[PDB]
Design a protein around this nucleic acid. Sequence first.
DNA 1: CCGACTCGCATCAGC
DNA 2: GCTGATGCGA
DNA 3: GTCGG
Length: 327
Amino acid sequence: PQETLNGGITDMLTELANFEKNVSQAIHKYNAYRKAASVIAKYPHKIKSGAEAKKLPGVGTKIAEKIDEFLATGKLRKLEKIRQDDTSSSINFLTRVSGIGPSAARKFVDEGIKTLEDLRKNEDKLNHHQRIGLKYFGDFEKRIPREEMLQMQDIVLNEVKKVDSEYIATVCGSFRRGAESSGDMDVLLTHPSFTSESQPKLLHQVVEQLQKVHFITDTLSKGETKFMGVCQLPSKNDEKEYPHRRIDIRLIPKDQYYCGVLYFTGSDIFNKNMRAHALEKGFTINEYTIRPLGVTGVAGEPLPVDSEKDIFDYIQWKYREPKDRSE
DNA sequence: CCGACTCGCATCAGC
DNA sequence: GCTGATGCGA
DNA sequence: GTCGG
């Protein structure tokens, strides 16, 4: 629904989620608050009481109490307090830098490094990832309009094919489900020569080529199967330059590729539903494989998968195109 | 009451 | 130096 | 923090 409904409550819960994760280092509380925020965000009524909210799965006694306080007073004492806490707010802020997690942010604030300006002045204390995250701090917080993702995909698919026309590349994520904007670009790559039983240059040569045509600008991490870096669309030579964007590229064995594409296309919710359903039909699906479950629950060998549809067929599901994988 | 809620890569801690 | 743990991000 | 075995 629109924010007008329960945006005050869901903003409250997301803020609380962030402090749990970045300050208290309580990742399961972070996810509990996020779960609560999402179920409330989908609730098609403006909530009148904590009790009403507690009926929703993921909202318990304490969040119901917080909702009561927020509805009565328009705020939450504990969040007002942590918001003005110099240490906690600074730790929370610093984690917006890619590469600065809760542990680094706490360490920085402990020694008086609290702002982007402070980080800019203490580059020797930043690792390579963190330096890149700082350099592109604002760019990395911008969304990517679908039209730019299409231009991005144009470049990726062209250059991949140029390196070896037998590569298979798929841009996944919400983009593949048809989303009007994305947060980053997630590219899944395979090659008929790379199987689970099989070159440690297949990923490198694609990354190199994207660097050679000046699409990839920076590297956060790169190994034999996963690249995580930065890219930028070329600008009209005249026009404003495009923001730098996060791009990941994963090399996946061919016999696990479509399980990978299915998983990294999502949704998260659709993934959970499909996995639930697979179990009930006697299969276990993870990001790599689909395997049959015996009558005592013992997993068999992975089943051949040569399309996304193969996975749907095994669990006797109607194939659904990515646009209908919302749930 | 009390435990649950994945992995590749970079880097650190320990040997 | 090498091995395993940790932090991080997704 | 919430759920549930």
